[PDB]
Amino acid sequence: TSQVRQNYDQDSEAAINRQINLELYASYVYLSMSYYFDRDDVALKNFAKYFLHQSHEERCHAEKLMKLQNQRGGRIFLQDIKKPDRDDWESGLNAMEAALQLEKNVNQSLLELHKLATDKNDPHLCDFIETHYLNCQVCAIKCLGDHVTNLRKMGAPESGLAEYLFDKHTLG
């Protein structure tokens, strides 16, 4: 048993390692989307950038979660990073919609993780999430949603001019 461990439950420890992988996954998904728009037949540099940043952000959440693990005394155990669902994300609107779902999912995962920490009376963990992931996911979803909304209302996905202008004005 780690000398620093205190009030950190086994389920929580596992829950985290699990959350860690989901984050690494999310990062991989975003990495996949980024380079989809980098393709000469898609060509939307800002979508590409937007997503790559989104990618780097998730890998950062992953690492911060790993830090938490070591801080509490729990041991980290890595699992394969599943490959993303698709390989082709169609249009900018599809990618956004996809991302909106992914976030809503990761958020679902976090809320479950919070309930777990509440049933285990781990105030420190509940807080670490409330401040570092909860309000973050809420802002991410709301943004994604807005993009989805504007893209639909601009004529996308059928309209190629719409995504172009979106890549410029909103993501640029």
Residue count (the chain): 172
Site for its own copies in 120-159 (CB under 8 A): 121, 123-124, 126-131, 134-135, 137-139, 141-142, 144-150, 152-155, 159
SS3 assignment, position 86:
coil
Complex with Ca ion: residue 117 or 156, whichever CB lies closer: 117
Please tell me whether 23 is known to bind a ligand.
yes
The residues of the shown chain that bind Ca ion, judged by CB under 5 A, are 127
Query: Which x/- pattern, by CB under 5 A, does the window 124-163 give for Hg ion?
Result: --x-------------------------------------
CB-based burial label for 107 (10 Å; 0-12, 13-18, 19+): middle
Cα–Cα distance between 62 and 109 in angstroms, integer? Answer: 13
State the nearest-atom distance from the C-beta of 17 to its own copies, in Å. 10
Alpha carbons within 13 A on the beta-carbon side of 87: 1
**DSSP state letter for 162:** H
The answer to whether the beta carbons of residues 100 and 148 sit under 8 Å apart is yes
Q: Which helix (H) or strand (E) holds 128?
A: helix 123-129
Residues 4-22 as b or e (16 or more Cβ within 10 Å = b): eeeebbeebbebbbbbbbb
What residues numbered 47-106 form the site for its own copies, per CB under 8 A? Answer: 52, 59, 63, 66-67, 69-73, 75-84, 87, 100, 104
- Interactions with Hg ion, residue window 63-122 (CB under 5 A): 118
- Residue 123 as a binder of Hg ion (CB under 5 A): the answer is yes
Nearest distance, CB of residue 101 and its own copies, angstroms: 10
- Tell me whether residue 11 or residue 161 sits nearer to its own copies (CB atom): 161
Give the residue numbers of the binding site for Fe cation.
23, 58, 61, 103, 137
Q: Which residues bind Hg ion (CB under 5 A)?
A: 118, 123, 126
